[PDB]
Design a binder for this molecule. Structure first.
Ligand SMILES: [Cl-]
Ligand code: NA
Lengths: 110, 111
């Protein structure tokens, strides 16, 4: 009913557990009453904390393999992981959502 | 009037100044920039792939334990984001200290 830091903390644990069980990210979003970009923001929070996740099962199903390869190469060769920088370089070809997803994979693989 | 040509030239000059070990605050003044504006230009340079070394300046102006703690933060971080660094470090270190060490770290690890 009202967000608290404890329920936010528990939600993130839940999202991780769902990702481990290979639940589709869009299904996870619905399960928590989130829009897709809101879910991406939680997953980014999770990844920033150093939590090891793996969303290949989802990326491989929904994304164009060439888009994935080219966005990933951009991150491999980049100096900063910044989304703003990635949009400046890649935004003429790829959406924010594609770039955010591959960025999650890239940061998670550190 | 700023143009893409004279901005590119200014950056070339900044890189040369840093190579010649000119203090960053002196570089700022020489280009009519305030310090944070200079930091923004040095960030642009580093993002582009130029391996600059600003140890001579950091070692002169920054507290040694501050440098080590912030550097360690970046080494252990997942994202290099300034926003995340500020959330994690902003109660102990200034934005300028964090930006300087982040330049050092990004240049070393990538460029
Ligand atoms: Cl992080
Ligand atoms: Na696209």
């Amino acid at each position: 009913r009202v967000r608290t830091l404890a329920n936010k903390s528990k939600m993130k644990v839940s999202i991780v557990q769902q990702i481990d069980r290979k639940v589709a990210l869009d299904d996870i979003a619905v399960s928590h009453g989130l829009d897709f970009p809101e879910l991406l923001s939680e997953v980014e929070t999770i990844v920033y904390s150093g939590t090891r996740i793996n969303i290949d099962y989802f990326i491989n199903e929904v994304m164009d393999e060439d888009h994935l390869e080219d966005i990933f190469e951009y991150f491999k060769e980049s100096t900063t992981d910044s989304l703003e920088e990635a949009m400046q370089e890649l935004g003429k070809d790829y959406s924010e959502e594609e770039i955010r997803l591959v960025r999650i994979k890239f940061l998670s693989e550190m």
